Amino acid sequence: SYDSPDYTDESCTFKISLRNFRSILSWELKNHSIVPTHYTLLYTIMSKPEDLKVVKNCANTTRSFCDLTDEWRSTHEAYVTVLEGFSGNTTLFSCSHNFWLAIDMSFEPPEFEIVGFTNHINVMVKFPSIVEEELQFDLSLVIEEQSEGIVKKHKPEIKGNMSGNFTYIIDKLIPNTNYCVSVYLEHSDEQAVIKSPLKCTLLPPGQESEFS
């Protein structure tokens, strides 16, 4: 059916994550005809596009996602990147993209769960142990609350809160409230919603039970 043998060819899509406020950029270049294996993740900063680096640990590598915790310390900048993938022994392609960290910051790896009290909520976001007094990202945390059909977004002061087991409490709720608590970061923007797989933790559902 249809007339088109070639539908897709090299998504050349670089996915950047953020584990414990550590940067890790990856790529999505599929192969149709030629069979590539090793690649070379090259990266730079928008303000200095002339300073691209073929990361030694991400050059002719027969891997995909390359990491960068202290390699992209220019969070405030847009880490422009050029991932040149070599098919076998030759450079088969070269794709670039302006990574907006300061504006994108994709968090998810961190640990997080939530305990719900019959009437309140206990949200603990497990961010790495870091002393804000020397942090690299001013990034905030957005505690989203999806209780009993009600969705919401919180944003507690991360001034020294992103250093371990974040302690937040979602209260002011009626008994029996199963909420899906997400953990996404923000920064004066409603487009950087890295809403990770929430936690739908319910609380001891009152339901009266002949108490009054």
UniProtKB/Swiss-Prot annotation:
Which cysteine pairs are covalently linked by disulfides here? 12-95, 58-66, 180-200
Maturation and modification: Phosphorylated on tyrosine residues upon interferon binding.
Task: Please describe the organ and tissue distribution of this protein's expression.
Answer: Isoform 3 is detected in the urine (at protein level). Expressed in blood cells. Expressed in lymphoblastoid and fibrosarcoma cell lines.
Please give the residue ranges for the topological domain Extracellular.
1-210
Provide the residues annotated with a glycan attachment (glycosylation).
Answer: 31, 60, 89, 161, 165
- What's the impact of mutating residue 10 to Q? No effect on activation of STAT1 upon IFNA2 or IFNG binding
Record's subunit section: Heterodimer with IFNAR1; forming the receptor for type I interferon. Interacts with JAK1. Interacts with the transcriptional factors STAT1 and STAT2. Interacts with USP18; indirectly via STAT2, it negatively regulates the assembly of the ternary interferon-IFNAR1-IFNAR2 complex and therefore type I interferon signaling.
Q: Which family does it belong to?
A: Belongs to the type II cytokine receptor family.
The disease tied to this protein in UniProt is: Immunodeficiency 45: An autosomal recessive disorder characterized by increased susceptibility to viral infection due to impaired antiviral immunity, resulting in infection-associated encephalopathy. Affected individuals are at risk for developing fatal encephalitis after routine measles/mumps/rubella (MMR) vaccination.
> What this chain does, per the record?
Together with IFNAR1, forms the heterodimeric receptor for type I interferons (including interferons alpha, beta, epsilon, omega and kappa). Type I interferon binding activates the JAK-STAT signaling cascade, resulting in transcriptional activation or repression of interferon-regulated genes that encode the effectors of the interferon response. Mechanistically, type I interferon-binding brings the IFNAR1 and IFNAR2 subunits into close proximity with one another, driving their associated Janus kinases (JAKs) (TYK2 bound to IFNAR1 and JAK1 bound to IFNAR2) to cross-phosphorylate one another.
Q: What is the protein name for this chain?
A: Interferon alpha/beta receptor 2
| Organism of origin | Homo sapiens
Q: What is the lineage of its organism?
A: Eukaryota, Metazoa, Chordata, Craniata, Vertebrata
The residues of the intact protein that this chain contains are 28 to 237 of 515
